[PDB]
């Protein structure tokens with residue numbers, strides 16, 4: 001019964017570097033469209049699948065930016081945050097013993113959503129030497145004939161890695177050969193740096209039929225507290241997820257759907273996303289310099305707004321290194337072990353905080369690294 | 376495993392609408408705009424904002440006599456509808472039974488199937504003004520029964536359980552060591568001699584009770600998706616664990632507007648105005664339905680009325696099929712709310728007075744015309 005699956009799941013001056021959301025505020029003009037919606041009286045229930053005009057704007061964005069062709073009436077569904085998608089998506093198909101492969105270090109909702117859907121998560125390590133990009137040769141070590149799905153997250157949280165098109169082509173070969181469904185969490189697609197490119201696995205030939213691509217407004221617009229996300233997937237999966245929603249949150253907030261549908265079509269939205277991306281890029285270069293500078297070897301992340309320094313050479317546990325940085329440096333970083341077994345030996349730092357707080361946090365980490373001769 | 380249980384599930388004047396026709400009171404809309412300007416745009420606690428939980432805790436104390444701790448026993452949800460799946464998922468085990476009074480709201484049985492149990496319908500009867508009767512509950516309990524869901528004022532019937540009904544069902548609940556889920560979203564829309572009481576306020580009941588309520592029906596906020604439950608700590612702790620892998624948290628600036636609205640005089644004023652208008656409409660449709668030849672119990676709460684249709688010789692489904700194309704009015708077959716709903720139709724009077732009168736004339740013209748009386 002679900003209560004059974006739920007008990008198998010667990011878990012003054014101080015700079016928090018543990019944040020997993022934009023420090024920016026929602027762009028003013030998106031605030032303004034939600035005020036207009038309230039005044040227009042968009043107060044009542046909407047369809048379980050989302051407002052058709054939001055789904056249509058989302059079909060346009062997916063085709064033009066991601067190369068995905070999805071039908072608005074049938075294949076895309078609006079959600080209360082992209083987070084709902086893991087449990088509801090996996091529940092449209094996962095049966096009782098089935099395994100889902102999760103590349104690790106991974107976002108924290110993946111494995112519990114698998115356990116709640118009734119399956120068994122199987123962690124597949126990614127490695128520092130590979131700049132944490134998934135390798136299909138690790139996938140092979142873990143396939144069984146109970147494997148039904150793979151979850152991919154690019155750009156990745158906690159790592160900041162982004163899969164290249166060739167990476168995705170190989171993954172696409174493995175998935176088709178093993179007849180898996182891929183769930184692709186793309187919420188960080190627009191925060192990509194240097195010469196990285198965001199490719200969607202559902203745009204490759206023959207792949208839409210087998211992937212659930214999840215995305216949302218939370219990170220690319222700074223709308224985490226607005227609870228609006230979406231999936232584009234085959235209609236037999238969408239059908240099952242809206243039936244689930246009927247008995248869960250019924251439908252998204254309908255005036256926020258209006259604000260967001262207009263926002264996708266507004267030039268100033270995209271302009272604000274580049275503002276934010278240029279500023280996250282500036283902060284990234286600082287924490288990458290400074291962390292390598294103080295002795296913690298760190299891969300330059302190509303996407304999202306997280307960086308993942310190697311702390312294992314200080315001789316500590318990622319949990320003990322988190323304690324020591326909080327007690328003595330008063331900076332909060334999250335243990336890499338919280339992102340799966342392959343995260344032990346690292347710590348997640350979010351640079352979604354003001355440049356200046358990051359500078360100061362970096363000096364404070366330095367001093368107790370030197371002071372406590374951990375180097 | 377949840378996939379198998381999903382598999383087990385599921386010129387007209389529409390009278391089938393289950394939501395307020397009113398728009399949200401303007402002052403609540405402005406509190407929302409203000410939260411937006413104040414930047415209340417980021418993630419909040421999974422259990423919901425503490426300001427909102429403290430506000431809900433004084434409302435529950437004052438209006439309902441339920442004492443609950445804002446820190447551990449109140450949780451904000453994305454509509455009250457989340458409470459049934461998530462609340463049942465805190466304790467229900469495989470194949471345990473949940474008693475469901477019928478005619479009932481459509482979420483309850485699918486919510487117990489998704490959670491892993493089996494719904495057992497318990498009939499309510501028009502002779503009893505559709506108030507759940509304990510003798511009927513005695514016939515259906517088993518050693519597999521773990522919970523009971525009650526809904527007062529009730530959708531689809533409009534029935535509201537008496538303080539003595541509650542006292543007797545409370546008895547039954549303790550005797551059978553069940554937990555009760557109490558759906559109280561229509562609490563402010565009660566009429567005539569009716570009074571709303573909360574089963575968690577009685578004698579030792581808080582510990583055995585999940586009470587769900589929200590802002591959708593009382594403040595005309597159905598599209599805002601804000602509801603709440605007050606329940607013991609161990610139920611709340613498991614429901615916010617579930618929310619972390621579900622919708623994460625309600626929308627922050629909506630929560631602030633709801634908090635400021637519980638405290639505003641104009642909110643409670645808005646509610647008497649909507650209650651006064653629904654009562655006017657209710658008198659109209661109860662009168663018109665009986666005199667038109669359809670024996671109808673005068674509902675005492677919510678905004679729904681449930682006329683007897685079976686003496687026309689039609690089934691609930693055939694009668695609404697007839698009314699949709701002959702009268703152009705949409706009513707919903709009683710059989711959609713359980714099998715004790717057969718022979719009846721739910722009409723909602725959450726539409727304008729004028730359209731209700733019109734709708735009533737259209738139904739009366741086709742009743743007399745196909746000699747259905």
Ligand SMILES: *Cc1c(COP(=O)(O)O)cnc(C)c1O
Nearest residue numbers: 081082083107157187216218229
């Ligand atoms: C923030 C985030 C999400 C959740 O999106 P919400 O819309 O806020 O529910 C999903 N995936 C990752 C990897 C994220 O970091």
Ligand SMILES: *Cc1c(COP(=O)(O)O)cnc(C)c1O
Nearest residue numbers: 454455456480530560589591602
């Ligand atoms: C409308 C209604 C609800 C509340 O659903 P929301 O999710 O809050 O919109 C719950 N129960 C009943 C009986 C209802 O009629």
